[PDB]
């Protein structure tokens, strides 16, 4: 059974049925396509069905380097001993590096724009082409690797390809960690949840399980509530770039051709820095570009992201909202007035009771994103707990955590502490004016912007072998 | 630009070797030229009346454009830019109808100039027939489909020739080059930023295949009644080993300067024996921005070159082919001082690497154990394959041979040895591996102890005029050309970045060295050694690559001991009756011919061990003659070469390639040369993968789990169901007209053979066969198109309905074990086929690539019995989750089916023959009567199903299998293809050999049916041709 | 696992020396709470028509989306204190942490 063209509910499909009086899909014999996640133990009458993580749970920049040996090798430049990652062999972004293409049999790219003939990109993770803003981040880190390997060759001439690559990989990985924990996570959780769930790091604990919890695959999808309905492109003075400054998000999905043919990654990174995110509000959860027209160009029907999230939690056999509340030591509302009090919104509690009949049945994502945000944070108490717990385990249970002893020297740790995403953009693009720390807060040009010259670049001195 | 050249075919007397004095050539012994050039009452001579293409100024053909004198007998230089409407005004003063047919340029049927059946009116048949005293205007156009690809350069190599009977006009001389280039790469008809442009055509132009051959004999031969045309020695004297016609280095005008940015457009032409290996002596060239030295030219093969003229002097452009090299296939050229005016590098004296090799004679036993390891059968088994080579008796030498070979010593004294570790155990007949970095200076102290003068010829490094291994010229003490039996010489080579690998090539490249006094004979004595020239900052102090685990050197070749100078010794020493030794016997020559891999035969080469997780870098190279067409296959493993993923590597004399691999399957695998007469001839070996990393339950990655039903069924196979395509072709050629393959005559078989093929069945019942749909009708003799997507688990629930044991197995597909179990008459088995990343396309491969699924019970005989099929391993989101997709997929197997080598020959002799009591299997006329030259198993425009629409993307999967004579030059009429990821390369004549598997992406636009054929004389005349139908919109 | 290693393995194997697959790629997720399936071990809620969850009918995902998630885009509130880069780091980071494979 083909889940893409058939609406028949047979393995490995679990299509989402259409309700009557649907604002888009008029034919109730139709459906939104859905492939059940791969089981860990196929066809078992013994095991309880669980799903697979194809990636390393660690914050180790595996989206850049890969999580399997065949790919990791093929992502490297094997034409020399410089320790580089392979770059595109057909295109450049103003003389700067891009991703090695992958052959156009019929990958989603050659579908967004037929005549442009730009295939998807190849990176450490299979999803690098999903939106051009994501592509731009992949490209950014790939440039930083090749930049670090270059500078390390000059500082340490005896070093071969392997040593250069591993050392540049160890740096990028640490940079992903610093930005994530120092800048990103406090802005997701807020101060109170930060203190509670992510106390000050001490050292590595070999008894802390670093595996991604099944629920996190759904809970971390809170970010779908931050999505703006457009891709925003800005020129060198941060003004709307003509003639397409605001591209509807349903025309950018898998649009790899926009990176290559429509001005590279600079107008994209600038647009990401100087445009506000969408706020998650209780009556403004997620935009119709992902609710109604997700992947419209690359398949038979526009998808519904929020609905998929909910179908996915069921596929994964995830417990409901109250079960996760109880897990997190949070009170469980049982009546509509109780849910109203917990959400501090009776009108939404009612809508949820109308849908689910009891708060016990609310799907983790829906219940999670519905909760009012914590102060100076962008998730509610339930998501804060799930998200917070996951990253503490990913930190405390990583042997190669940048702050763990013997991973780096004292002077290397001191030098790394001076990195920032803005500085990486300064070091790897044609952008000379970037956001003030914190990049994730600043977004108003020119109020929250400084010149690249003010930001110290990373000191590789303590990497000299001598 | 609207370009109007005025081509004219005349009939002039051509001089093959225009003297004028006085040459000594490489291995050429003066009194040997007269074999091909001397005129008597039996030999035709050096002058030949031939058809020729000439350029003219006017529509009125009265004054010719003089042709460049290095161009020889070739037609005028035609160039065409992207979008230029190039016209061609052909006139025929000649006594017979000819044509103008061009490669890689768009034309209407009204302007193709190639005659063959094509349901077309007269107006579109006027171009196809241009008689004497006629004029035609050929409207051509260089389109976006036709122009050079992204990865190509500004200009690419193309050709044009007369096309009534392809080869017979070419052999008569009508062959001219076209230079297709990009839109604005030219100024004053001269490529932008190019100093000189030279066209080079290697062709053993066979005058026995020329129309005028008949009128050539009446004039020059003093007795036209004492001559038979079926006379081999008369046929040998007329095969003209010629580059642009001028034979024995008689080629003139080749004048180039220092720092001259020179482009070389070299293309091969002729027949099966036209196995060419071009090399510029002490010169560094680049193809597709890869560092090369030896090109490989074959019929209709289109190839270009970019060389920065360096190292001034009077050099040689010789043919590698050791038989072609001893037949004056050479050409001199000068790089002069004028003077520069730049140097570059630079570093003569820097890093000094010192080696102390010495030549010596030993008893070399090819198969030391005395057993063929593949079966545990011993070498002297009665009647067997290995028996013929490894028999010692009255006039047969046996397994042991005396052979001069390289061996390294530690110092200049040559008293004590540098010993061979576990690494050097595989080298054997190969000498020391010499290795260098860019910036070094290699110095080799050669101490010859053999009773013949020798040298060392490095291929891949720069060497001065007084350090060259070989000698050649236009005009005691120990030198470089000559190192007498007692002497010692000190070589001094330079290795800068002008000869070293560039960005695009992998770290190390495969290179070789061999004695250069008589390389047609010296090499066959075993004086060959591996080389390994590598970039700056790469190798360890010991010599290996950084982070590369193993380093292998395989030199698969046919060691012809008949050509050895130690022939007279080996006769006297091992044969029982030395008096009875017949040197000029064809059964004796095949004995001394020892098909080996590093001097080892049948699986005896050891030291080929590695673990599950090693960085294996295979360095391959070859030598020999027009029989050395190799397909070195690694079972259950896939290497990467230039971003192209294969398992079968191709070699020809003086080819040298660096394949990169990483083992994934544990087991004792095979290094078997696919060439079907080498394989049983002794070119099959063993490499082992252990377990040096804990097992650990893998298989957590299964994005696909398919199941297929194949069955080796027996049916009567008709090679030409209707011979109606055969008559119209010959009729349109006025030809007459005998068919050695298809005609029955008195006792021959004809077209119908009882063969065994794979076929697709519905299910486990094997009652309902799958119906072959119209798009998949082109398969013919081939089995169902198996599709596997990176990450799949392909189940083959095979059945063997045949009367004898067969087996199903693929190329490059991951399996569990090192053994494929055969299935028997009635039995059912399941063969697990895993599809990892390594079995899929590479970063420079088109996502859909083909693999050959075959049979392992007798890969030589089952193949020819009818067991072949295409496996299509694509990437990921191709499948559409369904079936019908707008990406037409065609698969074409190019193989000379040797019906002799079937399990059902003795059944074909009894069922279909009128007189079986008159069939002797050991007759060459009957052996030739059963080598059916068929694409997908169908001859003479018999292969239907080939149909595509205007504005379609049509995939072509071309498979190569078979024998030494199974080199196939696949050519498409009317349209070209594009290879390389993204379609970066473009060509209309491709190189398909026994082992190569390639996707070709074609973008057609012109509607009409087109000639699809291999471009090898014999093979074309052997019906290896079909058509494809491009139809216009609805 | 070697006694010494300055760098991570690609797979993530050997990070935890006592349980070397923990955190490694191509492994089952850990479960913080036991799985809730319609048949208790495999089939998802909403698979079998009429079969209720915790005594109440399973709501179609698409209907919950329509009645709770759907809002008119002109009502959109830009975050005055977060940039679009806050969204994008989140996705980039997620792709460092998990990808849940499906059959092709
Ligand atoms: C360009 C915007 C994005 C698009 C098009 C996108 C789309 C998707 C899709 C189609 C899925 C799988 C849905 C399913 O079939 O179950 C998915 C899953 C996921 N996404 Fe989003 N995503 C984006 C933004 C984000 C953001 C901003 C976050 C978090 C801050 C996020 C978190 C994830 C996670 C954690 C999963 C589960 C992944 C897995 O383990 O396989 N996404 N997304
Ligand atoms: C490093 O990490 C491990 C894991 O977080 C810490 O071990 C945990 O310690 C707590 C309290 O000692 C254990 O909880 C206990 O549960 C038992 C059994 O139900 C109960 O009898 C006690 O009331 C207590 O609550 C928890 O099980 C244990 N986890 C593991 C995986 O062993 C460890 O203490 C940390 N070490 C350092 C030095 O920070
Ligand atoms: C490897 O590096 C060289 C030098 O920077 C570069 O020119 C080349 O494109 C790279 N090769 C690949 C495959 O990325
Ligand atoms: C597709 O890309 C081309 C460039 O090849 C561009 O000019 C065109 O606008 C694009 N098509 C669409 C529908 O945006
Ligand atoms: C050409 O047309 C003739 C009838 O005029 C017919 O025999 C044949 O089908 C056509 N050729 C092919 C092979 O399509
Ligand atoms: C092969 O068989 C022959 C007898 O046919 C025997 O003399 C010989 O020992 C065998 N070969 C070896 C070396 O084992
Ligand atoms: Cu031709
Ligand atoms: Cu061979
Ligand atoms: Cu052929
Ligand atoms: Cu042609
Ligand atoms: Cu032709
Ligand atoms: Cu033949």
Residue numbers in the entry:
A (entry chain D): 113 to 578
B (entry chain A): 1 to 475, 483 to 1041
C (entry chain B): 1 to 104
What does the paper say about this structure?
Human ceruloplasmin (Cp) is a multi-functional copper-containing protein. Indeed, Cp oxidizes highly toxic ferrous ions to the ferric state for further incorporation into apo-transferrins, catalyzes Cu(I) oxidation and promotes the oxidation of biogenic amines (norepinephrine, serotonin) and synthetic amines (p-phenylenediamine (p-PD), o-dianisidine(o-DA)). Mpo (EC 1.11.1.7) is one of the major proteins of the antimicrobial system of mammalian neutrophils.
Here we describe for the first time a low-resolution X-ray crystallographic structure of the Cp-Mpo complex and present SAXS-based structural models of Cp-Mpo, Cp-Lf and Cp-Lf-Mpo in solution. Despite its 4.7Å resolution, the crystallographic structure of the Cp-Mpo complex provides useful insights into the complex formation. The SAXS model of the ternary complex is compatible with the crystal structure of the binary complex Cp-Mpo, indicating that the latter complex is likely to preserve its structure in solution. The structure of the Cp-Mpo complex correlates with the earlier reported alterations of spectral properties of both proteins due to complex formation. It seems likely that the interaction with Cp changes the heme conformation in Mpo, which, in turn, may alter the functional activity of Mpo. When bound to an intact Cp molecule, Mpo makes the vulnerable interdomain loop inaccessible for proteinases, which protects Cp against the attack of trypsin, elastase and plasmin, preventing the cleavage of the Cp molecule between domains 5 and 6. We also observed a modification of the functional activity of Cp upon formation of its complex with Mpo, and another Cp-Mpo contact site seems to be important for this modification. Amino acids in domain 4 of Cp localized in close proximity to the p-PD-binding site are involved in the contact. The likely mechanism underlying the activation by Mpo of p-PD oxidation catalyzed by Cp includes participation of Arg185 in Mpo in substrate binding and electron transfer (via M668 and the cupredoxin domain) to the mononuclear type I copper. Thus, Cp-Mpo interaction favors the antioxidant activity of Cp.
